[PDB]
Amino acid sequence: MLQYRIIVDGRVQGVGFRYFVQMEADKRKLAGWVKNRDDGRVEILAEGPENALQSFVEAVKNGSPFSKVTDISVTESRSLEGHHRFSIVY
């Protein structure tokens, strides 16, 4: 489909952000993962149809309770790894 690599910065850890991203990804039937980086940022790999991916990016910007998204970087690829499911990963 398309794969997005999304990096989120701001007040985005210890705020239920991974859970929020996972609920949005499952709602939008996207596959991939969300993971906290040790530098405070959140990485998101998401694969799916373009309408789902675009609307997902907008939802991510709204964040979880107490979060504040100050930046979102997105890079894209047509090469999907064929992920199923969306996981909170370590």
UniProtKB/Swiss-Prot annotation:
InterPro entries: Acylphosphatase (IPR020456), Acylphosphatase-like_dom (IPR001792), Acylphosphatase-like_dom_sf (IPR036046), Acylphosphatase_CS (IPR017968). Residues 3-90 form the Acylphosphatase-like domain. Optimum pH is 5.3. It is an enzyme of class 3 (hydrolase). One of its GO terms (molecular function) is acylphosphatase activity. Pfam families: Acylphosphatase. The keyword Iron does not apply. It catalyses: an acyl phosphate + H2O = a carboxylate + phosphate + H(+). The keyword Kinase does not apply. The active site is at R18, N36. Belongs to the acylphosphatase family. This is Acylphosphatase. The lineage of its organism: Bacteria, Bacillati, Bacillota, Bacilli, Bacillales. The gene is acyP.
